[PDB]
Amino acid sequence: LALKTIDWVAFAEIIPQNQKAIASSLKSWNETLTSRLAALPENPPAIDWAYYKANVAKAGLVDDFEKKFNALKVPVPEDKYTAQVDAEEKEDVKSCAEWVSLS
Amino acid sequence: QTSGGPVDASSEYQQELERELFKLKQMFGNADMNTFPTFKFEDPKFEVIEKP
Amino acid sequence: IDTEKSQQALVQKRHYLFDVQRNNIAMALEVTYRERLYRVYKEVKNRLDYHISV
Amino acid sequence: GVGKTVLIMELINNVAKAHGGYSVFAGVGERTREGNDLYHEMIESGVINLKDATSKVALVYGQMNEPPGARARVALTGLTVAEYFRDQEGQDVLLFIDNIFRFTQAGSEVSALLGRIPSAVGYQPTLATDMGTMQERITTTKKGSITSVQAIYVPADDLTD
Numbered sequence: 001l002a003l004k005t006i007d008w009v010a011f012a013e014i015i016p017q018n019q020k021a022i023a024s025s026l027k028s029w030n031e032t033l034t035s036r037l038a039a040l041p042e043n044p045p046a047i048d049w050a051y052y053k054a055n056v057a058k059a060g061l062v063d064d065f066e067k068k069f070n071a072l073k074v075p076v077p078e079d080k081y082t083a084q085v086d087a088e089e090k091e092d093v094k095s096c097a098e099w100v101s102l103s
Numbered sequence: 104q105t106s107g108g109p110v111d112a113s114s115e116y117q118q119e120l121e122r123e124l125f126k127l128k129q130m131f132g133n134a135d136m137n138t139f140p141t142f143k144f145e146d147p148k149f150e151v152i153e154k155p
Numbered sequence: 156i157d158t159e160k161s162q163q164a165l166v167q168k169r170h171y172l173f174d175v176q177r178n179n180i181a182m183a184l185e186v187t188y189r190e191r192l193y194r195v196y197k198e199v200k201n202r203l204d205y206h207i208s209v
Numbered sequence: 210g211v212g213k214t215v216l217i218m219e220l221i222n223n224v225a226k227a228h229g230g231y232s233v234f235a236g237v238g239e240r241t242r243e244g245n246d247l248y249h250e251m252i253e254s255g256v257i258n259l260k261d262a263t264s265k266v267a268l269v270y271g272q273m274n275e276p277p278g279a280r281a282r283v284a285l286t287g288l289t290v291a292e293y294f295r296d297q298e299g300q301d302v303l304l305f306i307d308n309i310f311r312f313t314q315a316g317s318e319v320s321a322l323l324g325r326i327p328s329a330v331g332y333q334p335t336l337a338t339d340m341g342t343m344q345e346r347i348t349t350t351k352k353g354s355i356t357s358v359q360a361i362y363v364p365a366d367d368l369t370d
């Protein structure tokens with residue numbers, strides 16, 4: 001979770017007039033996702049089985065639940081979107097350096 | 104002397120216990136709470152952010 | 156000349172748009188992962204707690 | 210004459226017919242012709258059925274022609290009906306009480322004869338505890354629900370009464 005700190009007026013000076021709404025929406029979603037990552041911790045509290053070993057008088061249901069949970073493969077979502085914005089950044093840097101040599 | 108009986112010679116206390124258990128289950132959930140939960144998962148949407 | 160140099164300064168500042176997009180992708184994926192872990196934890200604990208409560 | 214009965218009848222029309230559970234109307238110290246109107250309107254609209262057991266409303270009436278004891282306890286009778294429906298049936302109950310103020314007023318009318326020193330505005334000294342004993346039974350428990358609509362008369366338009 002290594003993020004790139006961003007100036008928020010420099011981000012504004014570089015936005016053409018056909019995607020001002022898109023820049024504002026990206027900004028709003030950045031703030032929303034920061035707030036939502038702040039309002040939930042990193043790792044769920046793995047509850048000890050103690051309160052469920054010595055307080056459940058049922059035949060191994062707690063035990064098979066804990067076995068099925070210890071070996072669960074929860075799907076980690078893949079990026080599938082950062083590579084293409086990296087390609088777009090490369091293309092944009094190319095165009096910008098060309099225009100700068102013209103200038 | 105409660106081997107042959109579940110609730111120590113009750114002969115009653117089921118007509119209300121079933122309503123109580125109905126309320127308790129329906130306020131804890133609606134699915135079957137005796138089996139492991141299967142997990143449907145979703146993936147966040149994403150748009151055409153590419154520079155127009 | 157001054158105007159052209161300022162245009163070059165803005166071109167130098169350009170990269171924040173793609174920084175923003177990458178930040179949002181990473182943060183959305185992290186939020187989704189943590190919400191999924193909380194969902195699985197909550198369901199397991201909730202069923203165990205229904206058992207203990209009955 | 211500001212529209213308490215009109216509003217409570219509108220609520221009976223808008224909620225009680227569309228209601229899935231049972232309903233209890235306690236007329237407390239009100240017009241008897243209003244009770245007759247409600248009875249016959251509920252018969253017309255099928256909410257009360259005189260021929261089979263599909264009726265959905267129970268009526269309990271002690272009206273303004275009744276001595277103060279009946280006017281003081283008829284609200285409790287309606288509460289008892291609604292409480293049975295809430296506890297032993299587990300149903301969701303609708304309880305309309307028009308008018309609940311009469312309850313308090315009826316107590317006032319007997320408070321002097323019971324030999325008690327009057328409180329403010331001549332009311333019984335036990336106004337708040339009597340009202341609390343009555344009203345705490347009008348409630349939703351975790352055994353069943355009671356949605357309660359009570360028309361409350363305001364004497365001489367004084368809300369500080």
Ligand SMILES: Nc1ncnc2c1ncn2[C@@H]1O[C@H](COP(=O)(O)OP(=O)(O)O)[C@@H](O)[C@H]1O
Binds near residue numbers: 212
């Ligand atoms: N929703 C209403 N629309 C039009 N007139 C109303 C309405 N409510 C009350 N009124 C008028 O006020 C009068 C008194 O109605 P009512 O509800 O019986 O008084 P109370 O407050 O004593 O119960 C009605 O006859 C009617 O003329």
Ligand SMILES: [Mg+2]
Binds near residue numbers: 213214215239
């Ligand atoms: Mg009225």
